[PDB]
Amino acid sequence: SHMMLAALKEKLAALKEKNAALKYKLAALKKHKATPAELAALEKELAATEKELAALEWELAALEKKEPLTPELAALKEELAALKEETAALKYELAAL
Structure with missing residues (x-):
């Protein structure tokens, strides 16, 4: 096996866990009305x-x-391609807060 693959597989897994943590950050912000700074933080x-x-x-x-x-x-x-579509779906969800 190639080290090019394992380093790529780890980055694809870490970005899938970063997207899941973004999902939970959205859930918490649907409770507290949130400041623009907190909205700009999730956007950044x-x-x-x-x-x-x-x-x-x-x-x-x-x-x-x-x-x-x-x-x-x-x-x-x-x-x-799935991670890119999953990230974009979090952008539209955030834009409705």
């Missing part, structure tokens, strides 16, 4: 996830250039 955390997902596409892209026949290449591209 949302933009940080979009940046990490965008650089991960380049990370996965460098792996395809040096090893296009590596197994899990299709599942890693689909897992990143």
Whole structure:
């Protein structure tokens, strides 16, 4: 196995746990009406996830250039596309607070 895969798999798992922590941050803010600073804080955390997902596409892209026949290449591209759609769904939910 490649260390390019394991480092990519760990980052895909950590960003899935960062999205789940963002879900719980939304739930708490549906209770307390929240200040603009707290609303701007969850938004800045949302933009940080979009940046990490965008650089991960380049990370996965460098792996395809040096090893296009590596197994899990299709599942890693689909897992990143799901994380991007999951992050965007948290953006629309926040915009209604």
